Amino acid sequence: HMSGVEGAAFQSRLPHDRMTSQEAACFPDIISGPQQTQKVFLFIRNRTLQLWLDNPKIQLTFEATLQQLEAPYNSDTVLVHRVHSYLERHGLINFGIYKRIKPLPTKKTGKVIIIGSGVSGLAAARQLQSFGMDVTLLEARDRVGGRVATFRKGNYVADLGAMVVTGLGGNPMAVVSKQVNMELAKIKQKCPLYEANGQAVPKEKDEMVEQEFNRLLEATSYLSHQLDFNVLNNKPVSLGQALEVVIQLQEKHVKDEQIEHWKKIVKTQEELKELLNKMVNLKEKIKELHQQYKEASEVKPPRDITAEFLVKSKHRDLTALCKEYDELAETQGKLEEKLQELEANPPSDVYLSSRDRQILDWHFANLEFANATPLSTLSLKHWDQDDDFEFTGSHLTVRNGYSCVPVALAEGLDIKLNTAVRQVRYTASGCEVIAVNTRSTSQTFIYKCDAVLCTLPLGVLKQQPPAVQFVPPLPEWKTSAVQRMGFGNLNKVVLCFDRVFWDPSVNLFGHVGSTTASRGELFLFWNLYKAPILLALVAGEAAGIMENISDDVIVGRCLAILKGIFGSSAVPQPKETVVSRWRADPWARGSYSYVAAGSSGNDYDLMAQPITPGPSIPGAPQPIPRLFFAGEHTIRNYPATVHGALLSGLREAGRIADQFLGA
């Protein structure tokens, strides 16, 4: 993304120097043919994208495209038309909110019902309407945006749903942010921790625990990919299981290390013992031999030569033994030095202290927040399967509130709010969607359409007994995917005060939980809003449990933790408080998808696959597909995100248009 044309390819999540699978399908003549024609194709594509991206507030037409192409790229008018049409159809250009050069024809082809007015639903609806289809969105809630929900009272603004743009580098919300007035503000990465008591973690310790966390994660990846530790007792290995195992092996090594150290101390002590014994025996033989010499020397001259020899021989023998003992006394000295050195440099007493395991649990809580699930549920092998598609650049927050995006997308769309879909019927001839008014449930509605786009959250599709009945029932391959896949939970506590008592230069600050069981409970506080608002996350096992506890108690536990960090005099009572309960929300049944143990990226593709009904009269030709699926749980490469939802909508609009208007 250094060049201008190459930068557009990157911003559109396309390889600038190669044709994609989708391109091979729509341009088989080109990709199967000479290299020169492919390079021409790739430039026309890359350039068209550049033009759209440079000004995404107005429709890029085919004519406007052909104008600004230099030869020999503008030579082939049909190739330029095919490229433009492909890009428009698949929502790579002329997506979001742009001024249209030519008004849409009042004559509409085909009828589509879209279930849900979330970003996936709205993204699809806009595309389909702009392709000249008749679109109606059915929405259970009294509002649009779905899991994008912004709280508003006076000047107070706080997202209870999606909050963060995870970088603009390759992000389609980059285009939407130019089209819609979003106040995008960078998140300052500095995040001080504060232990149970309210004391900031010592800098050196903080750095040590964090480094151990990242090593523990990398270890699970090694455990997974290198040692192939992915099944245990005919059950898929959790990330939690792998972390437990990796920790236990680190605790084992600490003990194994101590043993080897003490084992070489006893081996030196048993050398010293064997020496000291030899020196004690030799001292007795020296003592005895000295007496014998003393007695022989006491015999005064004159004496015969045998008496002289006895004095001399004993003197010789005593000097020889006094040499041995002095050599052993040296050997004793160096073994005593070695022993004092081993006692001075012992190995680690413990792998992790009680406080270190507590601070480490915060990093696990952070990971449980990110995946919106207990680490015991995450697939070790595939929890991070979308890593290669992550965007580049600083993460940003929406200061004016994320709702600004769906509300903007909803302009000019036929949206039935307070309309809860109960039954989806799909046959060879078409579809009936049976909904009710959420207020008076007896007021029944029937919508007849050529196609149904289902953007129901995975939480709703999972609900047993079902909130929505499919007739005929969804195939085993679809329902198995729904059952297998993870749908997580993550809650937010909005605290609105009259004055700022926290560090305005710090956007993020954590609280370390007392125990492992409570590590997710109000583990993080967010300060990214203009007004004095603090947003507390409830992650991990804590999320599900804290939904069965009153807002007062939760606001209670919040103030307690803040008092601990800032002191009782600094923390006032909050003016306004909100507590999200996403698992209990019957139009969500959770926060967003995770790759559950026993699932993979492949299930996200199964979720995206449309249903084709059986024939009406039998021996009748294979019907066309009727029931289509979009939403964050349908996009393998960008799951559990707003950009994922948006991209999933654009994808299904193109698949539906291709089907019912022709490619």
């Binding site: 995870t166 995040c191 995946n371």
Partner: peptide, 9 residues
């Protein structure tokens, strides 16, 4: 997913 992690290494 990983993307949402705070204090990313």
């Amino acid at each position: 997913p990983r993307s949402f992690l705070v204090r990313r290494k």
